[PDB]
Write an enzyme that holds these catalytic residues in place. Structure first.
Site, PDB file in Angstrom:
ATOM      1  N   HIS A 152       8.320   1.550 -10.694  1.00  0.00           N
ATOM      2  CA  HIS A 152       7.189   1.293  -9.826  1.00  0.00           C
ATOM      3  C   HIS A 152       7.580   1.394  -8.345  1.00  0.00           C
ATOM      4  CE1 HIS A 152       3.342  -0.481  -8.662  1.00  0.00           C
ATOM      5  NE2 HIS A 152       4.015  -1.302  -7.875  1.00  0.00           N
ATOM      6  N   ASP A 173       2.387  -4.171  -2.980  1.00  0.00           N
ATOM      7  CA  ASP A 173       2.328  -3.618  -4.318  1.00  0.00           C
ATOM      8  C   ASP A 173       1.022  -2.889  -4.536  1.00  0.00           C
ATOM      9  OD1 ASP A 173       2.195  -3.057  -6.964  1.00  0.00           O
ATOM     10  OD2 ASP A 173       2.729  -5.057  -7.642  1.00  0.00           O
ATOM     11  N   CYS A 200       0.958   5.295  -7.223  1.00  0.00           N
ATOM     12  CA  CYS A 200       1.608   4.171  -6.525  1.00  0.00           C
ATOM     13  C   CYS A 200       2.415   4.599  -5.286  1.00  0.00           C
ATOM     14  CB  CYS A 200       2.504   3.358  -7.496  1.00  0.00           C
ATOM     15  SG  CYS A 200       3.691   4.244  -8.572  1.00  0.00           S
TER      16      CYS A 200
END
Ligand SMILES: [Ba+2]
Length: 352
Positions: free
Chosen positions: A124, A145, A201
């Site tokens: 991630h 995030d 992401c």
């Protein structure tokens, strides 16, 4: 030391540290949704330094790195996890810096967060920022995030929050404290900011990096601030240009944009060629590509294209404007100031 044009990249394969570095090139492209006329260059290893126009603030942005990684254990019964010693280094190097610093700073690490229990290598892309205020001797960490989640329906019950870790926050916060073992600084409250399919992401991260910088210079969004122009910029950069690391370094330290050279177009074509050979017929697009590369090399040589070579190029115009290949050619032609291929190649041609 060279980030090659990854044609067919399209923002879902996901980021990796090299790509992200390459994206850093956009920070001084005036024609960019990521342009920063808020910072100057400044005259701290592994990070590029930025002075604030309009401010006292100092901004350090770390070069992305395949080792800036934290691995957490989803099981809560387990050890919380780990950080690469390199990230720990950078943390310590940051505190060592701040102890001597007199002007307030903000530190920016793009890093990667991943579960080690699960066999699935879910890596991630995620952003760490540590701001330091010397009057307070305060050091506040935040993690940004891009997989906000938190859905009422798929919320982890408190008890299960006890059974399962969703993030490294434990291990990370541990690492920061360790860096500060001196009890020389006050650590502010570690918060995690979340927001916002999965493969997006990283590009989000890069956008945030911009924001974190801009905000820092100035201080201080319902949806889609990852503007399409933002995406067009990122895609075209990763996809169509050929950057050396030296080039990017130099760019971020001298505060210069990096114009698109003709060689970039050529390489881009060749890579498109290889990839396309793997997959208008194939032999058609390959003949077009070939012919075109030849012409551009001959230009590069400073030689004049033969009139014959030009007429050759004229059917290939249709074959080279088509779709994907078309968008590559279009990018570079935009960036060389030519309306068409015919226009670009019309001068420096020797006529019979
Ligand atoms: Ba460690």
């Amino acid at each position: 030391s060279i980030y090659p044009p990854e044609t067919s990249w399209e923002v879902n394969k996901g980021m990796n540290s090299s790509r992200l570095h390459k994206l850093y090139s956009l920070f001084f492209d005036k024609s960019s949704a990521f342009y920063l006329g808020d910072d100057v260059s400044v005259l701290l290893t592994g990070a590029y330094g930025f002075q604030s126009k309009k401010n006292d603030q100092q901004i350090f942005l770390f070069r992305p790195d395949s080792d800036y990684v934290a691995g957490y254990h989803v099981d809560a019964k387990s050890d919380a996890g780990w950080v690469n010693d390199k990230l720990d280094r950078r943390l310590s190097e940051i505190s060592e810096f701040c102890s001597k610093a007199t002007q307030p700073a903000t530190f920016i690490l793009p890093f990667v967060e991943m579960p080690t229990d699960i066999t699935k290598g879910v890596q991630h892309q995620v952003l760490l920022t540590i701001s330091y205020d010397p009057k307070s001797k305060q050091l506040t960490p935040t993690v940004y995030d891009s997989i906000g989640r938190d859905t009422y329906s798929e919320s982890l019950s408190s008890y299960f929050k006890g059974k399962y870790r969703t993030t490294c926050d434990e291990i990370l916060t541990q690492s920061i404290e360790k860096a500060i073992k001196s009890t020389d600084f006050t650590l502010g409250k570690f918060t995690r900011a979340a927001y916002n399919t999965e493969g997006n992401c990283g590009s989000y991260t890069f956008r945030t990096i911009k924001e974190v910088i801009s905000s820092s210079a100035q201080g201080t969004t319902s949806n889609s601030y990852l503007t399409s122009q933002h995406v067009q910029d990122i895609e075209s950069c990763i996809k169509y240009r050929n950057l050396g690391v030296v080039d990017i370094e130099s760019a971020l330290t001298e505060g210069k944009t990096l114009p698109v050279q003709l060689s970039e177009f050529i390489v881009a074509l060749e890579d498109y060629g290889k990839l396309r050979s793997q997959q208008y017929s194939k032999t058609a697009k390959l003949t077009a590509v070939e012919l075109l590369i030849g012409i551009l090399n001959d230009i590069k040589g400073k030689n004049e294209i033969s009139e014959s070579q030009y007429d050759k190029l004229v059917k290939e115009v249709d074959c080279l404007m088509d779709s994907s290949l078309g968008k590559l050619v279009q990018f570079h032609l935009k960036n060389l100031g030519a309306e068409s291929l015919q226009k670009l190649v019309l001068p420096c041609v020797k006529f019979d």
